[PDB]
Design a protein around this ligand. Structure first.
Ligand SMILES: [Mg+2]
Ligand SMILES: [Mg+2]
Ligand SMILES: [Mg+2]
Ligand SMILES: [Mg+2]
Ligand SMILES: [Mg+2]
Ligand SMILES: [Mg+2]
Ligand SMILES: [Mg+2]
Ligand SMILES: [Mg+2]
Ligand SMILES: [Mg+2]
Ligand SMILES: [Mg+2]
Lengths: 53, 176, 119, 145, 96, 106, 141
RNA sequence: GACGGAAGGGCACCACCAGGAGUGGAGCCUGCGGCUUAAUUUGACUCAACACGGGGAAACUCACCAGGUCCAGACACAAUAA
RNA sequence: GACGGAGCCAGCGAGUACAACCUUGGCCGAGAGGUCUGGGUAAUCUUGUGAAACUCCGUCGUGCUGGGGAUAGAGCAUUGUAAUUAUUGCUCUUCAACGAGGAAUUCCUAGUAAGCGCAAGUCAUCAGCUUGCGUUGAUUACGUCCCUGCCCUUUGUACACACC
């Protein structure tokens, strides 16, 4: 409820936020994925990226 | 969506992945295997694979409907635009995820690990594939943790003989 | 030797409008002034004024302690005891010449400035 | 291009604006030796004067030199605005100045003194003998005094 | 958590209407979709409801996945009084 | 009863090539059966979506990189054809994977 | 209209395209003569095929080369290749087999591509090194 | 099995020859270690740590230090209680 | 070689919605960067990414000198609620160490080495970084086990925490 609990979280690490764990380190924003690297590694074959070259 | 084609495709892929994850989380007892997303301009179809179909359905159509509702809520879809179809896999002993789930269930009930693994291997053999291997890592009722191999038939490891001809599932079991 | 702030002499600036000072200032300062005015230094100026009032007028005011190292002073202050926060410690600073338009953080050195080697 | 051989008229090594100006450097680049005078701006000054750049240091007649000096010391009148000179805007007069030879250093010293008086971070750093403009002293500046 | 009672009631009503609730782990934020309330409160309410059976919960991709059992539904109805034969979507209406 | 020629572009999008090929074949067959003016399935520069990522989840170890790539196939078709019937045609036959997009203009 | 042959030239990624027609004696790079190309030194490289064959074999020709890609040297090489290829194509179409053979012989006393397109294409730059084969710099301790 | 300043037989430009190109020298740049500090958060220490944690951090990040809020303590039962 | 002009040529990318992207073209400013407009949520528009390095005409000419641009001043913008402990950028002036680098050691055998850029990743703003392209394009091997390892075979081991 507090109108003093949050300052601007506009960019960098604020709005630039994870879409799996809730982390902030290693954020591939390419094609608007917003996934962490490690998670992506174990999921990319389902999202559709592979090891062709 | 109106967004770029490439981006749209990526988003769809991500959505699919998310769906898969959800199914893995939720449909443990329901015996989940795999998901497909078919998109027609008016109707979005998701085909779910499972072993205990009645459970997936609910009563008359309890659980599937709720899942559809959830899906609608999540990625913003108008009620009726999305649909679900839960259907059997004709060979349960080929889809790796299903096998993994079965193994997990065996473990949580209180079975011996080795025995369970052997049972799973036997089941796979009965189903009919050109060999399978089971890897069980961690504590095997010991303070020091080890690795296990339960191999039958013959395996492949490198190439495009991997993809399509192989199914791989990693599933972790939490215990006391 | 007296002092000229930016052309305009010492005495005239102790009671002088802010806008004029901004106009006759570095570009960064101008930009700062442009960007945000309402409810941005809250009432730092007001506090300073109050402090000035409470003083015997010939004496320097009571210490006003700010966490704002970011603050650039306007020439309406000057001769005001602004305690600047250095993470833990309040640093006392007195201003007479053109530290006006310069950040308060510059005068309270944050890191404790070295001992090192003893050789 | 000049076919002119020139007789004994040019005297090398000139004493101009107190600091010694050396011989046969190309006018602009002869002037650069003086502090406050720098390449591009020297060239500009020369252009303003209306002396051909492709000449010797000793070649310059006295009048031309005088003109150049005038241009340097009083810059604003000869169409040289802000993106031009040394102390733009300035802290002491409001007018901009193209400080020279033994002035710029003095100004710098004065600034340092003022900083010291008013105990600012930069001033403190200068007093110490440390690097100011965003440098990591983990490796930077091991030459000392 | 202590939620303004009316808001809580509204949330409950919405849940009943749906049979499905989301609200991501996006705390502090102004407002949830569909229901015009602060999200944290909603989440807490949901958790409370779950604590005794009632609702289901999954944390997947920070989403929260809230659906009620029939007993839970009954309890919800009791909480908000509401006459017989008012349906979520567990009771089938359409054709597929 | 309408009978009005549209002059319409139809774009396909697919991560899978075989499915796309099948769809193209289907479209060609449709064109043949109804006898319609077309520009034959035109290929595009296939956008390869490269995500360069260190394989290590901790960083401690040797510098190993993996470029996880997704080759995306476009392929479009241009149909100079009538109205309602054409619309009906350009809706049916769906393969899993490939996305069909029909635009507008009359 | 008079039949005319289209040819191309490749090196690295540079693409030349020559158009050989029947006419007066044109030899053109984009919109300019071979007397220009670019680097002045490498003017002889593009002129070389002509020198080899005989300049009289051009008294009835029109040549125009559209060149895109590469850098400069590569472009020049591509142009040269295209010209050679253009000539051979023309011979194939309009002239005689013995003539073609002669042309080939003249070229193959050098074989700086000319009639045969070059292999040797850029190798991908791998990770853990600035170059394709070049590894980084091993530090140890 | 390992190991041998053992023996044969083979290999390799993280081996060398025949050579490049340099770094190590200079300044800077970034990362360490070491010292300092309220804190300089940390994990890496032969390749296989040291432009590595995607780590090009002004808040965020975030972990550290100095301060100030907040309950996000479900639920159970006791008491409080209109 | 640097410094001026003037020639002129690339390939990967990436880029707008339920937000504030890549930005052209025309006027501002001497730069950066503003500004009204449109194009482009993609082979189309930015972008032929007219990219450097190079190419030609000059100017300078064995000089810590126009080589080097660190360090310092002072000023104008930009991003951001917030730039001081220069965020960056641009103009200025300031011109140090540095005459090809000890013992040492890395990397490389063909479109490779190196030079040279660019785009992307990070990103609100910033590349000296990585990751991928593409221009320019050599020299010398095609071999041996001497040093450093590795592989198997035999051999000897008072060693299996296995020569640390
Ligand atoms: Mg095999
Ligand atoms: Mg193989
Ligand atoms: Mg190794
Ligand atoms: Mg980095
Ligand atoms: Mg220079
Ligand atoms: Mg240079
Ligand atoms: Mg191109
Ligand atoms: Mg010099
Ligand atoms: Mg920074
Ligand atoms: Mg020993």
């Amino acid at each position: 409820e507090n109108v003093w609990y949050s300052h601007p979280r506009k960019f960098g690490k604020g709005s630039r936020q994870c879409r799996i764990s809730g982390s902030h380190s290693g954020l591939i924003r390419k094609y608007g994925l917003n996934i962490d690297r490690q998670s992506f590694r174990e999921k990319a074959n389902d999202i559709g990226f592979y090891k062709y070259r | 969506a109106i967004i770029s084609k490439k981006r749209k495709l990526v988003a769809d892929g991500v959505f699919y992945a998310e769906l898969n994850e959800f199914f893995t989380r939720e449909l443990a007892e329901e015996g989940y295997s795999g998901v497909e997303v078919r998109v027609t301009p008016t109707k979005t179809e998701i085909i779910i694979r499972a072993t205990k179909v009645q459970d997936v359905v609910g009563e008359n159509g309890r659980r599937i409907n709720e899942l559809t509702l959830l899906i609608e809520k999540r990625f913003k879809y108008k009620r009726g635009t999305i649909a679900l179809y839960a259907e059997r896999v004709h060979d349960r002993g080929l889809s790796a995820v299903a096998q993994a789930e079965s193994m997990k269930f065996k473990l949580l009930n209180g079975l011996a690990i080795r025995r369970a693994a052997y049972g799973v291997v036997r089941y796979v053999m009965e189903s009919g594939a050109k060999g399978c291997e089971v890897v069980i890592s961690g504590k095997l009722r010991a303070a020091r943790a080890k690795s296990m191999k339960f191999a039958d038939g013959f395996l492949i490891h490198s190439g495009q003989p991997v993809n399509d001809f192989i199914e791989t599932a990693t599933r972790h079991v939490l215990l006391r | 030797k007296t002092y000229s702030y930016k052309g305009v002499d010492l005495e005239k600036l102790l009671e002088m409008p802010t806008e004029d000072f901004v106009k006759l200032a570095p570009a960064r300062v101008r930009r700062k002034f442009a960007r945000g005015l309402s409810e941005k230094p809250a009432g730092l100026m007001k506090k300073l004024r109050a402090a000035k009032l409470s003083a015997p007028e010939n004496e320097k005011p009571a210490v006003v302690r700010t966490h704002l190292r970011n603050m650039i002073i306007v020439p309406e202050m000057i001769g005001s005891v602004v305690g600047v926060y250095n993470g833990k410690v309040f640093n006392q600073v007195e201003i007479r010449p053109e530290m006006v338009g310069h950040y308060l953080g510059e005068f309270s050195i944050t890191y404790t400035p070295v001992r090192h080697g003893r050789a | 291009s000049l076919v002119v051989q020139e007789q004994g008229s040019f005297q090398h090594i000139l004493r101009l604006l107190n600091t010694n100006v050396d011989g046969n450097i190309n006018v602009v680049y002869a002037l650069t030796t003086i502090r406050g005078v720098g390449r591009r701006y020297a060239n500009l000054v020369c252009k303003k004067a209306d002396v051909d750049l492709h000449k010797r240091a000793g070649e310059l007649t006295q009048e031309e030199l005088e003109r150049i000096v005038q241009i340097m010391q009083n810059p604003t009148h000869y169409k040289i605005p802000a993106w031009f000179l040394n102390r733009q805007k300035d802290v002491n007069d409001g007018k901009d100045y193209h400080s020279l030879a033994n002035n710029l250093e003095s100004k710098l010293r004065d600034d340092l003194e003022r900083l010291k008086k008013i105990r600012s971070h930069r001033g403190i750093r200068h007093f110490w003998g440390l690097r100011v403009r965003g440098q990591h002293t983990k490796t930077t500046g091991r030459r000392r005094a | 958590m202590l939620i303004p009672k009316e808001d809580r009631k509204k949330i409950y009503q919405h849940l009943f209407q749906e049979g499905v609730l989301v609200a991501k782990k996006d705390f502090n934020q102004p407002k949830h979709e569909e229901i015009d309330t602060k999200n944290l409160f909603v989440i807490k309410a949901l958790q409370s409801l779950t604590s005794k059976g009632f609702v289901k919960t999954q944390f997947s991709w920070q989403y929260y996945y809230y659906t009620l059992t029939e007993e839970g539904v009954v309890y919800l109805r009791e909480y908000l009084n509401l006459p017989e034969h008012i349906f979520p979507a567990t009771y089938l209406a359409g054709q597929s | 009863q309408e009978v009005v020629i549209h002059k319409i572009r139809i774009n396909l999008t697919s991560t899978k090539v075989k499915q796309l090929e099948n769809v193209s074949a289907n479209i060609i067959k449709n064109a043949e059966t109804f006898k319609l003016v077309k520009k034959g399935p035109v290929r595009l520069p296939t956008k390869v979506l490269k995500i360069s990522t260190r394989k290590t989840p901790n960083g401690e170890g040797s510098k190993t990189w993996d470029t996880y790539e997704m080759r995306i196939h476009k392929r479009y078709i241009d149909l100079e054809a009538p109205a309602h019937i054409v619309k009906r045609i350009t809706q049916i036959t769906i393969e899993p994977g490939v996305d069909v997009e029909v635009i507008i203009a009359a | 209209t008079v039949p005319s042959v289209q040819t191309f030239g490749k090196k690295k990624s540079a693409t030349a395209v020559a158009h050989v027609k029947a006419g007066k004696g044109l030899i053109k790079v984009n919109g300019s003569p071979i007397t220009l190309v670019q680097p002045e030194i490498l003017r002889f490289k593009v002129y070389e095929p002509l020198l080899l064959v005989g300049l009289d074999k051009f008294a009835n020709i029109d040549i125009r080369v559209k060149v895109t890609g590469g850098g400069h040297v590569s472009q020049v090489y591509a142009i040269r290749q295209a010209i050679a290829k253009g000539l051979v194509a023309y011979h194939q179409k309009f002239v005689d087999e013995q003539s073609k053979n002669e042309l080939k012989k003249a070229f193959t006393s050098y074989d700086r591509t000319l009639l045969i397109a070059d292999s040797r294409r850029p190798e991908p730059k791998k990770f853990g090194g600035r170059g394709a084969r070049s590894r980084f710099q091993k530090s140890y301790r």
